[PDB]
Design a protein around this ligand. Structure first.
Ligand code: NDP
Ligand code: TOP
Length: 171
């Protein structure tokens, strides 16, 4: 199973304000949808509440501690680990937020697909700081504003150590 975090953030890693997105960025919404269709998506309960309904054409998984919580059109699990355990056969599970889920998922994540907006918004929740020594950039695409803020799509893949790593060429 590949664990992938997808998130949109500003230059300070801000992702949210009052349980809403701090911006409207159509390019990001198109990107997110095209990436997530036909994959299982995992979100925390507040993010589901923010979205307000299941995202169509995808398996919506919601994490909550509330044992008797019912959400039509979503699968409920009582921990991220329980969800990941149930999805063992999936080639890729996409974690879609929010801040609490991202923080918990990051130590298990293999991949990150990040939209980074070149602007500073006002807000209350952030994407977790990742260790730049642990991850390599596999794709970076910068976009000028039109989408009224400039933005980039940055893809990262988790590494494996210079001391122990294999090498591409040998004499
Ligand atoms: N910019 C972006 O890409 C994104 C932004 N957002 C933003 O993030 C914010 C929401 O994030 P946040 O408030 O952190 O909430 P989350 O979306 O991470 O949901 C938190 C809730 O999820 C449940 N939960 C999380 N982890 C566990 C666990 N390990 N075991 C059991 N239950 C768990 C709990 O539900 P319960 O209370 O029911 O027990 C908890 O209150 C919003 O502002 C939203 O707009 C969200 C996604 C992406
Ligand atoms: C498709 O609509 C929404 C999607 C998301 C999650 C999300 C959106 N974009 C990116 N790049 N990563 C994510 N995890 C979060 C939302 O609100 C918190 C949405 O409602 C506007």
């Amino acid at each position: 199973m590949i664990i992938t975090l997808i998130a949109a953030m500003d230059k300070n890693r801000l992702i949210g304000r009052n349980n809403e997105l701090p911006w409207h960025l159509p390019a990001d919404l198109a990107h997110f949808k095209s990436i997530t269709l036909g994959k299982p998506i995992v979100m925390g309960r507040r993010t589901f509440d923010s979205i307000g309904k299941p995202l169509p054409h995808r398996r919506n998984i919601v994490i909550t501690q509330q044992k008797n919580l019912i959400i039509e059109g979503c699968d409920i699990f009582y921990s991220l680990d329980d969800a990941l355990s149930a999805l063992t056969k999936e080639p890729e599970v996409i974690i879609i937020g929010g801040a609490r889920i991202f923080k918990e998922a990051l130590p298990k994540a293999d991949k990150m697909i990040l939209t980074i907006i070149n602007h500073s918004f006002e807000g209350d929740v952030y994407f977790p700081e990742w260790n730049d020594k642990e991850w390599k950039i596999t794709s970076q695409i910068k976009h000028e504003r039109d989408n009224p803020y400039p933005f980039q799509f940055l893809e990262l893949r988790r590494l494996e150590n210079l001391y122990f790593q294999g090498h591409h060429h040998h004499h």
